[PDB]
Symmetry: C2
Subunit: 68 residues, 2 copies
């Protein structure tokens, strides 16, 4: 069981705006390798391109997936 | 960014033992469409068991679980 479903992502924060936890849809990078990962809120996914809050090497060619 | 990576799953609990949050690997159901979802910890996963779920999940042995 997961409380909130995909409406809330505890422990996950947006690497552009810094909201924590991400409320609503979350877009996770799949090619960024750092274990901290790279995530975006739906607003920052829609209006795009920060390099990262924690030294993540996110490139414009990286692909993002919706995290259910 | 997500703290703890795949070593902790905040907001996610095991439907067999009830641990919350799930520490370690987590297995989520692809076919259970209840918003609460269906999840299991790794030891409970690898010891197969009847676990219909704790929140009215209609989880059948035919349902498939993916590592999250
Ligand atoms: Mg607890
Ligand atoms: Zn954002
Ligand atoms: Zn990336
Ligand atoms: Zn368990
Ligand atoms: Zn199921």
């Amino acid at each position: 069981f997961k409380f909130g479903g995909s409406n809330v992502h505890f422990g996950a924060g947006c690497d552009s705006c810094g909201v924590y936890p991400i409320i609503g849809d979350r877009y996770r990078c799949k090619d960024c390798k750092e274990e901290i990962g790279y995530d975006l809120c739906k607003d920052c996914y829609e209006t795009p391109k920060v390099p990262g809050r924690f030294n993540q090497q996110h490139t414009p060619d990286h692909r993002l997936e919706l995290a259910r």
